[PDB]
Amino acid sequence: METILKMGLQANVGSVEYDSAKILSDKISELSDGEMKLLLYPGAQLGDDRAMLQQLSMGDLDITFAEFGRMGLWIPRAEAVMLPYVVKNYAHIQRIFNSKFGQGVREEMLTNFNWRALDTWYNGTRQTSSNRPLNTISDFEGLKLRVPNAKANLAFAKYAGASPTPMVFSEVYLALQTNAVDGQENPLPTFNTMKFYEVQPNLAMTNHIVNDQMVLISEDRWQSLSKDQQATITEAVSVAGKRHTNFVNNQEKELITFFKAEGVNITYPDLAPFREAMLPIYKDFDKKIGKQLVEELSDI
Ligand SMILES: CC(=O)N[C@H]1[C@H]([C@H](O)[C@H](O)CO)O[C@](O)(C(=O)O)C[C@@H]1O
């Protein structure tokens, strides 16, 4: 081996994201005949996504994952893509990523922050688990709902009427287990592999945020690779992404049966009241960004 790359991710070994990172790594080695290798640093051992993104900018890490909307911390308009109920499905996030708006964000990521977006995959639609059944939006009143350190998720919790509790991902299981919080929200593969179902007796299909999953490489690293090495990474990303998105789609169907068998009570609230409750988020965001951006993205 001669060219050694490093990838970091928050998700643990055993997660869909890790499984796909291992595919990346295996395909990079296979297609390069062992000349290239990808080392893997899971479980947020390097920090959270925000920290790993900075490490990519500095060249201390080569590859990491990030949602398009997470770019909003550095490129404010991108946040709109993570506001609850804006993105309808994966095909919609693909239209956004490929649109002139998406291209403009991707160019800014490369120019300012040394991030080259190679693809974006489907990471699932977030759902809300809890220690009591949630059948209507009114049931969110008083719910101590853990959220990531992300304003969109915090706003979902706030406008649903819950009491948002930001917390890093690695601390969630213990907080649920001890009832320090009453619930969390994440896609179903995550709810499975993090074992949150072991400590959450209810799951509500709020369908509130569609998460993509960009594969970012340091632009400096990319430019230093040969054309052959670039082709290897492009093909590895294509192979891994096809498998990732398909696995998430399959799991979103198959996991319902599994969670029921494990004793989880699954509820399906009417979502029209949830969508209505989120409208002030869009008005505020449009006011801050200076245009009707949420509506323009929703119509892309
Ligand atoms: C790429 C990445 O690290 N994604 C992580 C996301 C994002 O940080 C968040 O959605 C904001 O974009 O948060 C989690 O879902 C969470 O803490 O519940 C864990 C997940 O691994």
Residue numbers in the entry: 0 to 299
Pull verbatim passages from the article behind this deposition.
Tripartite ATP-independent periplasmic (TRAP) transporters are a major class of secondary transporters found in bacteria and archaea—but, not in eukaryotes. A functional TRAP system is made up of a soluble substrate-binding ‘P-subunit’, and a membrane-bound complex comprising a small ‘Q-subunit’ and a large ‘M-subunit’.
We determined the crystal structure of SiaP bound to Neu5Ac in a closed state at 1.04 Å resolution, as a crystal structure of substrate-loaded SiaP enables us to model the SiaPQM complex. The docked structure shows two calliper-like helices of SiaP, α2 at the N-terminal lobe and α5 at the C-terminal lobe of SiaP, interact with the scaffold portion of the M-subunit. Residues R49 and N148 (SiaP) form a latch between the lobes of SiaP at the surface of the substrate binding cleft, enclosing a number of ordered solvent molecules that extend toward the substrate. One hotspot involves the invariant D181 of SiaP immediately prior to β8 and K232 on the loop between TM7 and TM8 (L7-8) of the M-subunit (right). Adjacent to this interaction, the surface-accessible, conserved K143 on the β6 strand of SiaP interacts with D36 on the loop between TM1 and TM2 of the Q-subunit (right). Analysis of these hotspots using mutagenesis showed that K143E caused a significant reduction in transport activity (but not the ability of SiaP to bind sialic acid), though the putative interactors D36A (SiaQ) and K232A (SiaM) did not reduce transport compared to the wildtype.
